[PDB]
């Protein structure tokens, strides 16, 4: 319906790189808005542009009308209480305890009594299913359990804009099948708005509500996953199935071979 984020016509380019030359996105409420791309793009940089951690150069990032380079310093800190993100590999502080990881955004944000601050962590740690902790460290946590704490810090207070940088890292099909059901339920229960940047097509279309696709500076298609494959150029169609026919090079050069010699 109403848009959370209007991305409109940025050219945040890195010197040589042209990346995101002219693009425009719509992120509306309550809906899984997936994004697929080739590796070596600015996809996980794009989330920082939404987050305003990185700074745009020509466009506008409209968090409900207001641009996130125009607000003052005391509004910026208030604006980040609606949005919390996921760091690809999971970003845990390996010096504070796992009880101190998840309580940290509360104490960084607000003052409450200890019998409440210790109370919210024991609930959000149960909502991921890892509750018998709060005593051990981020060390001796298996990599499968690692992102789940980072998920709980992503739902610290109770934001309404969580961005996922590849939830399916290449883990077990167990933990892949775990986080499939974790994602929808929280979006159902807490009425959030998620974006998943992944390359994992049979999971991605089966769970998303809308898929934009960025290749290098352009939307090659959008909609629900039904009218992606209908209106597919044979550059984005081959991106879906991975065929060796299209404008991607499987052969590095084009030559008769029998022209130069071997030194």
């Amino acid at each position: 319906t109403q848009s959370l984020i209007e991305v409109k016509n940025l050219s945040f380019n890195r010197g040589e790189r042209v990346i995101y030359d002219n693009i425009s996105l719509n992120i509306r409420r309550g809906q899984i808005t997936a994004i697929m791309g080739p590796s070596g793009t600015g996809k996980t940089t794009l989330l920082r542009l939404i987050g305003g951690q990185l700074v745009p150069d020509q466009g506008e990032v409209l968090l409900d009308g207001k641009d996130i380079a125009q607000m003052s310093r005391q509004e910026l800190f208030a604006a980040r209480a609606r949005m919390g993100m996921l760091f690809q590999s999971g970003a845990l502080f390996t010096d504070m305890s796992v009880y101190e990881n998840v309580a940290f955004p509360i104490r960084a944000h607000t003052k409450l009594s200890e019998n409440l601050i210790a109370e919210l962590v024991a609930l959000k740690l149960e909502s991921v299913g890892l509750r018998g902790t709060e005593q051990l460290m981020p060390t001796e946590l298996s990599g499968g359990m690692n992102r789940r704490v980072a998920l709980a810090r992503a739902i610290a207070l109770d934001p309404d804009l969580i961005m996922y940088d590849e939830p399916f890292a290449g883990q077990d099909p167990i933990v892949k099948g775990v986080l499939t059901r974790l994602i929808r339920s929280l979006r159902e229960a807490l009425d959030l708005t998620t974006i998943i940047v992944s390359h994992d097509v049979p999971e991605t279309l089966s769970i998303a509500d809308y898929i934009y696709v960025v290749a290098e500076g352009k939307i090659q298609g959008e909609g629900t996953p039904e009218e992606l494959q209908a209106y597919a150029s044979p550059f984005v169609k081959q991106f879906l199935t991975g065929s060796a026919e299209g404008p991607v090079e499987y052969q590095f050069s084009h030559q008769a071979y029998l022209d130069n010699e071997v030194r």
Binding site: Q53, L76, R80, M85, F87, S89, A91, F93
Partner: protein
């Protein structure tokens, strides 16, 4: 003339590379104190200070013993070894405690500081902390800076004290002079406000250049962990050119 352009473009980058690092330093110290920073700071001084204490104590001896060996071998043919208590003290107070304790501090805590911040940029804890808005300059860097300014003059004093006691050990217990004479000449030549306090003013302005160059190369490194290890050996070169270069001037001054 192209390798000329490569050399030219490299040292042009190193100048700008400094002008960023000065701006990061003025952004740290000109800030309001964070809430409960003292509990962060004392834990930090437990990491940088107390860990390095052993490697400078037992290195305090071996500088002292060789000073107590060549200081004896020189002074015996001239016979006037009423200067043994003075030629152990005045070198150890004026130069080798500012100099050699810096090159050992740039070794351990000078280079373990740029790794710990070099690891924090790569796993993007520092990026994740910014989205929560805790601005990691005041959270991670600033207790890791003030535990380096305070903890180095607390080390050269421990270096110079165990150095002088070490010179007395192989001097009068294994070779033999008049302990009395020793102490006598020692306290009858070494002023306090001219020598020791000038031996600490040199050890503060070494602690600033050895940590601010160290904490910068961890922050403004790159990811891809060949990007950590190229930076942990970028401080230890850049410290030791600026320890000894800044020593000379200072010494000459406070010693016309």
């Amino acid at each position: 003339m192209n390798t000329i352009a490569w050399l030219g473009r490299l040292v042009i980058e190193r100048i700008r590379g400094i002008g960023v690092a000065a701006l990061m330093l003025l952004q740290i110290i000109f800030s309001l104190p964070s809430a409960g920073g003292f509990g962060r700071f004392v834990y930090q001084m437990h990491r940088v200070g107390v860990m390095s204490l052993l490697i400078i104590t037992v290195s305090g001896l071996f500088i002292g013993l060789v000073l107590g060996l060549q200081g004896y071998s020189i002074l015996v043919n001239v016979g006037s070894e009423s200067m043994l208590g003075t030629m152990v003290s005045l070198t150890l107070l004026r130069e080798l405690a500012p100099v050699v304790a810096a090159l050992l501090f740039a070794g351990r805590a000078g280079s373990a500081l740029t790794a710990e911040i070099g690891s924090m940029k790569q796993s993007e804890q520092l990026a994740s902390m910014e989205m929560i808005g805790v601005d990691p300059l005041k959270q991670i860097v600033s207790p890791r800076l003030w535990a380096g300014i305070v903890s180095l003059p607390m080390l050269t004093v421990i270096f110079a004290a165990i150095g002088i006691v070490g010179g007395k050990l192989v001097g009068v217990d294994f070779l033999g002079v008049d302990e009395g004479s020793f102490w006598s000449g020692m306290q009858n030549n070494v002023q306090f406000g001219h020598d020791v306090v000038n031996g600490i003013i040199k050890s503060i302005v070494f602690a600033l250049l050895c940590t601010w160059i160290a904490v910068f190369q961890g922050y403004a490194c790159d990811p891809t962990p060949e990007g950590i290890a190229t930076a942990m050996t970028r401080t230890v070169v850049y410290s030791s050119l600026c320890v000894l270069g800044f020593d000379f001037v200072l010494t000459a001054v406070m010693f016309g």
